[PDB]
Design a protein around this ligand. Structure first.
Ligand SMILES: *[P@@](=O)(CCCCCC)OCC
Length: 197
């Protein structure tokens, strides 16, 4: 449900073909929060339960609201945690195609992590989805050092965090439909683009 640790719990002798690493929003529960489970269910439908590993960013990532104000939009500890998961994926399952996502603070975390990542690992992330991207204006809708064609940003009209503010208005909490349809649709398309079908 809201907690998935498929990568950490997974057997390297039986690696999934696709590994999804997701960071939740501020104050959300488990390691997937409100949007992660919806995306996970659709990925499982497309690749099969054993074909995809769902991994939320837990550990040191406390999803503390105040951390949105820090330089990178999240804490250094959180960035270290997500980088560690990408590194664990690369080591445990070198042939797996990676995909990533994040919501709100988790989107800033995903962007910061991907920016700092070793290029050889970053290049294995076939697609990344960001909801209510807090650094949308600052980064011009991009993730530094990562291609635009592999990036999809969902920023609602009226969601102030997408326009350079840290105010939480109603549109910031309305990404449900995107997580149920277009976000997994994009991730599936990007994985099939490189893996075939
Ligand atoms: P997001 O981190 C919230 C918006 C960040 C700006 C507020 C200071 O997660 C929503 C639960």
């Amino acid at each position: 449900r809201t907690t998935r640790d498929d990568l950490i719990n997974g057997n390297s002798a039986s690696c999934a073909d696709v590994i999804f690493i997701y960071a939740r929003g501020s104050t959300e529960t488990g390691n997937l929060g409100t949007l992660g489970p919806s995306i996970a269910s659709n990925l499982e439908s497309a690749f099969g339960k054993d074909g995809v590993w769902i991994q939320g960013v837990g550990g040191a990532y406390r999803a503390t609201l105040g951390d949105n104000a820090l330089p990178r939009g999240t804490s250094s500890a959180a960035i270290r945690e997500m980088l560690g998961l990408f590194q664990q994926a690369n080591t445990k399952c070198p042939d797996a195609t990676l995909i990533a996502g994040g919501y709100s603070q988790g989107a800033a975390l995903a962007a910061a992590s991907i920016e700092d990542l070793d290029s050889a690992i970053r290049d294995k992330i076939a697609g990344t989805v960001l909801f209510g991207y807090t650094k949308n204006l600052q980064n011009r809708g991009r993730i530094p050092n990562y291609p635009a064609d592999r990036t999809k940003v969902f920023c609602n009209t009226g969601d102030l965090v997408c326009t350079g503010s840290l105010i939480v208005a109603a549109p910031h909490l309305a990404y449900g439909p995107d997580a149920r349809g277009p976000a997994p649709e994009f991730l599936i398309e990007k994985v099939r683009a490189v893996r075939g079908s």
